[PDB]
Amino acid sequence: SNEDLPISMENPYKEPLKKCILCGKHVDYKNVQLLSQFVSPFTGCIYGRHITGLCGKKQKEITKAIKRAQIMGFMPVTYKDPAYLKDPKVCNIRYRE
Amino acid sequence: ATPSLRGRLARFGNPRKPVLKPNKPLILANRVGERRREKGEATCITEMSVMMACWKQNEFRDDACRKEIQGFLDCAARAQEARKMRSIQETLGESGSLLPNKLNKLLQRFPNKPYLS
Amino acid sequence: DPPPSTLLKDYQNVPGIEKVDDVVKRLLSLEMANKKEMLKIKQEQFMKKIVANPEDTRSLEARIIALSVKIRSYEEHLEKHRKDKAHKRYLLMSIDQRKKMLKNLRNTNYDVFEKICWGLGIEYTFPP
Amino acid sequence: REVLQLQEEVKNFITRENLEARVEAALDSRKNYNWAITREGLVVRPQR
Amino acid sequence: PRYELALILKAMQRPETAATLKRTIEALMDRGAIVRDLENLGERALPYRISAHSQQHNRGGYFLVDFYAPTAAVESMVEHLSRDIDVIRGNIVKHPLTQELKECEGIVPVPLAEKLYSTKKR
Amino acid sequence: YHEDRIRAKFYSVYGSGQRAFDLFNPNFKSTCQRFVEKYTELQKLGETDEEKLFVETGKALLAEGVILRRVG
Amino acid sequence: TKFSIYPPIPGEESSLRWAGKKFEEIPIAHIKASHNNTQIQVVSASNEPLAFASCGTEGFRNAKKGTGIAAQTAGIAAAARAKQKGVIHIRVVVKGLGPGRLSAMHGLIMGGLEVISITDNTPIPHXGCRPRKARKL
Amino acid sequence: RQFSYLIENMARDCGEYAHTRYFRGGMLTNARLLFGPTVRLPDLIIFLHTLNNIFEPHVAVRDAAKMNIPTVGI
Amino acid sequence: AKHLKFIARTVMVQEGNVESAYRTLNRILTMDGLIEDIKHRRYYEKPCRRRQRESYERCRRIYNMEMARKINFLMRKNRADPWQGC
Amino acid sequence: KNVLKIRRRKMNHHKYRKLVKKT
RNA sequence: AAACUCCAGUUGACACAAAAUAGACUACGAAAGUGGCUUUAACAUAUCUGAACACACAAUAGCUAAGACCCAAACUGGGAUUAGAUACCCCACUAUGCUUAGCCCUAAACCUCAACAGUUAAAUCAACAAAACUGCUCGCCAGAACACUACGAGCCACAGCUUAAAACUCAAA
Numbered sequence A: 001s002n003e004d005l006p007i008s009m010e011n012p013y014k015e016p017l018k019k020c021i022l023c024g025k026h027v028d029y030k031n032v033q034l035l036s037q038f039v040s041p042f043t044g045c046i047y048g049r050h051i052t053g054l055c056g057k058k059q060k061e062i063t064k065a066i067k068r069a070q071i072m073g074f075m076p077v078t079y080k081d082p083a084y085l086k087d088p089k090v091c092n093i094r095y096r097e
Numbered sequence B: 001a002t003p004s005l006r007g008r009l010a011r012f013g014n015p016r017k018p019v020l021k022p023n024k025p026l027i028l029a030n031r032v033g034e035r036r037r038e039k040g041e042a043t044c045i046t047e048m049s050v051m052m053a054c055w056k057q058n059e060f061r062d063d064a065c066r067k068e069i070q071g072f073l074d075c076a077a078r079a080q081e082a083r084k085m086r087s088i089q090e091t092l093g094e095s096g097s098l099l100p101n102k103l104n105k106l107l108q109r110f111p112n113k114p115y116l117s
Numbered sequence C: 001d002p003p004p005s006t007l008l009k010d011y012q013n014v015p016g017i018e019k020v021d022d023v024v025k026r027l028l029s030l031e032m033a034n035k036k037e038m039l040k041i042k043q044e045q046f047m048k049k050i051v052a053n054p055e056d057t058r059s060l061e062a063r064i065i066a067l068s069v070k071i072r073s074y075e076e077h078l079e080k081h082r083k084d085k086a087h088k089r090y091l092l093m094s095i096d097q098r099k100k101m102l103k104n105l106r107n108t109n110y111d112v113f114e115k116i117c118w119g120l121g122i123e124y125t126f127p128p
Numbered sequence D: 001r002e003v004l005q006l007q008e009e010v011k012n013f014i015t016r017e018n019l020e021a022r023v024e025a026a027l028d029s030r031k032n033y034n035w036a037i038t039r040e041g042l043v044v045r046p047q048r
Numbered sequence E: 001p002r003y004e005l006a007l008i009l010k011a012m013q014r015p016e017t018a019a020t021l022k023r024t025i026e027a028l029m030d031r032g033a034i035v036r037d038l039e040n041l042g043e044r045a046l047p048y049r050i051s052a053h054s055q056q057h058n059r060g061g062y063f064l065v066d067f068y069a070p071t072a073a074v075e076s077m078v079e080h081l082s083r084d085i086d087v088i089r090g091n092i093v094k095h096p097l098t099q100e101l102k103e104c105e106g107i108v109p110v111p112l113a114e115k116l117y118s119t120k121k122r
Numbered sequence F: 001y002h003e004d005r006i007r008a009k010f011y012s013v014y015g016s017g018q019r020a021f022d023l024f025n026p027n028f029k030s031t032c033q034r035f036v037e038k039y040t041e042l043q044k045l046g047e048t049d050e051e052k053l054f055v056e057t058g059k060a061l062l063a064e065g066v067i068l069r070r071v072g
Numbered sequence G: 001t002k003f004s005i006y007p008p009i010p011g012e013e014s015s016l017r018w019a020g021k022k023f024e025e026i027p028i029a030h031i032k033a034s035h036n037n038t039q040i041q042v043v044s045a046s047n048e049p050l051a052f053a054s055c056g057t058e059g060f061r062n063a064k065k066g067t068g069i070a071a072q073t074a075g076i077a078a079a080a081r082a083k084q085k086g087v088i089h090i091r092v093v094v095k096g097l098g099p100g101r102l103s104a105m106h107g108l109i110m111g112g113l114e115v116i117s118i119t120d121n122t123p124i125p126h127x128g129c130r131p132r133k134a135r136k137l
Numbered sequence H: 001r002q003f004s005y006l007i008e009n010m011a012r013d014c015g016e017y018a019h020t021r022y023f024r025g026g027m028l029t030n031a032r033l034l035f036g037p038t039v040r041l042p043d044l045i046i047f048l049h050t051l052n053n054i055f056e057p058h059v060a061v062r063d064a065a066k067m068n069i070p071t072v073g074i
Numbered sequence I: 001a002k003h004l005k006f007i008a009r010t011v012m013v014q015e016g017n018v019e020s021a022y023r024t025l026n027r028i029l030t031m032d033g034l035i036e037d038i039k040h041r042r043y044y045e046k047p048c049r050r051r052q053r054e055s056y057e058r059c060r061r062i063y064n065m066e067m068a069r070k071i072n073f074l075m076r077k078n079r080a081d082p083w084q085g086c
Numbered sequence J: 001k002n003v004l005k006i007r008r009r010k011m012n013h014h015k016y017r018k019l020v021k022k023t
Numbered sequence K: 001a002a003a004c005u006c007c008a009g010u011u012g013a014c015a016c017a018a019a020a021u022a023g024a025c026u027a028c029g030a031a032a033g034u035g036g037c038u039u040u041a042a043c044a045u046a047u048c049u050g051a052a053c054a055c056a057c058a059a060u061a062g063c064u065a066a067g068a069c070c071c072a073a074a075c076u077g078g079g080a081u082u083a084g085a086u087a088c089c090c091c092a093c094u095a096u097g098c099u100u101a102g103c104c105c106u107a108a109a110c111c112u113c114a115a116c117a118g119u120u121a122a123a124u125c126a127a128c129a130a131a132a133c134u135g136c137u138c139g140c141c142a143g144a145a146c147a148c149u150a151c152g153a154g155c156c157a158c159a160g161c162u163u164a165a166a167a168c169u170c171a172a173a
């Protein structure tokens, strides 16, 4: 018919889906350094996903890993272990003005 | 990011039990709330309690408490003017992000349309 | 029940499984697996013993055999968990669904219905 | 392939013969499961 | 199945620590377990004070035992660890490396929910 | 359009050209469109591989003096 | 060096000192800010009591105890008895959200003590005892 | 409003009429009261924009149909 | 009770500025939710009442975040009228 | 909706329970 | 005010109770329900509907028996308030909430919206609410009140539950 008509196909400019910083990585309860990056330094409270930026699957894995590590004797509950205070800050929260 | 609303309300087609039970429809109004005055509190009490402390120790003789008395009067004078300064800035919107009157005229131009035209 | 030394259904037909170390045989046996793996071996035995085509899993015979293995697992579960109301419901519902399968098999293929009852030890009962 | 991989691993399993030798070897070594993540998704292994 | 024993031992000298590990691995073998590996995570301060067997502990030796065992051995092993006075805290979990992580394509964005209310004029 | 596949890859590999689009000129040709036209010419010469037809196109433009700075 | 709001960790080698004393050696001011009273105890790093004052021991009674100025007065009283015993720098551990939570700290400073840190130890049960039923007002 | 001035001039130049301002209720449906009993209404209404400034249809579209006036509209 | 002390909820004072240290601590406890939690725990909130409060708080967050998103989207249009007089 | 129908049932049941207690 | 004053604060030891944060997640289960950790078992049905004549379940409260007991707490006692206060407010304490073994079988058990299959066009549609409908099936409804009642019957229920009327009365509800 006509060569200039549009053709049916999938979006070629579609951007790849975004991935969480832990996408494709194993979350172990023994890796307390990683888990400590997702708790409050002052209270040890687990951060919600709106602060951690994790997907639902990894927010759950991190949460379950933290709870297991805490009660098995690997991780403190009421504060972030001071050894891990100088690790990369991956959470979106600021406590100082 | 706004929390999800998919499957949260009791509706035909939604198998699960409702997550949310809003008493008002979750639909944006064309107005924002009015600026809620902050509860007032007593000020200058620190200086007031230093003056009254000297009075207690000096038999309520102002001659010995001149320095503290003047300090209490200065705090009230500064705080009295702070009443005028804050009020002026509060009306001007110097500290507010925007005034509810100004923010509502802007929403009047872009009213939420929950209906079809 | 099958012996614990029985190999898993996945590793029973790999070539050379009989010449591996004894330790490797323990790790691929029922002894080192969960109970669900033992039920897959039980299901296989009943299929060869009863059904004409042990590879057809969608026939009414295979479903009755699969459900009969689940029913026995619930009965063993409830023997240890007598206040587990959730699994008591699953048992009673499963028994009712096997009777509904047996009814439909009796109406369509009586010769196969008889072999299913003998093979599985089911005494068919007409409802009151 | 899983039976072959498993057949080699069994050579390094602990037995009553090498139990005393494997314990002392464990006490001399250290295993670290700790590592941190960055905002770019990069692993930061510990300084050891 | 494959399990992982997370073992916190009382801070002791090397000879008593080896005797406790040997005594613990033999307990697993007596119950039918096939022990695969033993890893030392190092002696460290506990995240909190732990009272065990009429004693207070602030430091412990962290060890891992990777092993295969029948499902009935777990319950019996937990009882054995509760009576060993040199064990501060011992937990048996299903080995994390058995669970295979499904692939993830990324974050599928969620559009704002639509048609929650009829379009009638209110 | 078929050429959108070529445009998507070009923007990924080489990014948007530092040259500015002039959408007022109805006959404007960007570096991407110049790339697409050369890519189409070489395809009509019988070449059918995609990864090979893309590398030869970059060379042709460099020979013609075009600046192609790979993004990464 | 830049200022760190995180306290020095015991056993590590810090350079911070207060009158030649390390953080682990500074006495502790325990402030219990209740809804109807405020109790302040200053103790040494070894848990030796040095001074105790509450709104009740300062002559306040009933609803006047549950006020800021009442806690401020209790702080000054504890600071005075503590300063006599050789205390200058104190670590503050405050538990409770009563009205004398902050006012009790001001009294410690007005009494001559220097606060080097503030710690909240308000008890939060992680699931614990059922509190009393709500009030109908 | 970006084109109010342009449209008003085009109408004057062709010898026709323009209404680019706020449309008061009843200009068409109540014209006899607003203008007089002998007022002649338009025989054709041309909309260069059919939406008002709150992105709804211009009221004159509905009222033009009420008064049986044909409408041309972009 | 079993944890180390002077780590949790501890803020150091700078240059004798105790007010800024207390405000920082209060800001920490608020953002982590401890202040509202302590207050809600003074009297027992029955589960039916807790579920109603959480529902109300979640619907308010959605509304408040959606109204805020619309304000930021429309704020650019608060510029002076470009077509004044027309 | 109002609870006026519930209120009638409430009174009936209250007076009934009280009658049963009295007799 | 009463109450306690072998009281209070710090520190240490220390549950048969309850389960911050995560959760801005929206999952599991037939429903009831289920959000500390671990492990074991384990989540019916390869058409659909279907038992009020059955079977198995079913929050909280409650009953029987033997235990535990921090805290909360009907009742009860004391303090206060009030014209009175058998309440609202404060304190103390019990049944009870917990476990085990049996009962009881009720909720605004309501997301008051039945299951399965399908549609978004025509007339879109009383109102409001959570847009309007189609096929098919079971269950249920027919003015108000009497009445979650009477009687009968069944039930481990004996001041109970389930099923459930009529007479008189009204012109409304």
Ligand code: FES
Binding pocket: A018, A019, A020, A022, A023, A024, A054, A055, A056, A057, A058, E104, E105, E106, E107
């Ligand atoms: S986005 Fe892939 S696991 Fe989080």
Ligand SMILES: [K+]
Binding pocket: G126, G127, K019, K036
């Ligand atoms: K908890």
Ligand SMILES: [K+]
Binding pocket: K023
């Ligand atoms: K929550």
Ligand SMILES: [K+]
Binding pocket: none
């Ligand atoms: K009911």
Ligand SMILES: [K+]
Binding pocket: K110
């Ligand atoms: K309801």
Ligand SMILES: [Mg+2]
Binding pocket: B023
């Ligand atoms: Mg409502």
Ligand SMILES: [Mg+2]
Binding pocket: J001
């Ligand atoms: Mg109402």
Ligand SMILES: [Mg+2]
Binding pocket: J008, J011, J012
């Ligand atoms: Mg009545």
Ligand SMILES: [Mg+2]
Binding pocket: K050
């Ligand atoms: Mg059915």
Ligand SMILES: [Mg+2]
Binding pocket: K058
């Ligand atoms: Mg019940």
Ligand SMILES: [Mg+2]
Binding pocket: none
């Ligand atoms: Mg009971």
Ligand SMILES: [Mg+2]
Binding pocket: none
């Ligand atoms: Mg009590």
Ligand SMILES: [Mg+2]
Binding pocket: none
């Ligand atoms: Mg009791």
Ligand SMILES: [Mg+2]
Binding pocket: none
């Ligand atoms: Mg309990």
Ligand SMILES: [Mg+2]
Binding pocket: K109
């Ligand atoms: Mg309910």
Ligand SMILES: [Mg+2]
Binding pocket: K112
């Ligand atoms: Mg109903």
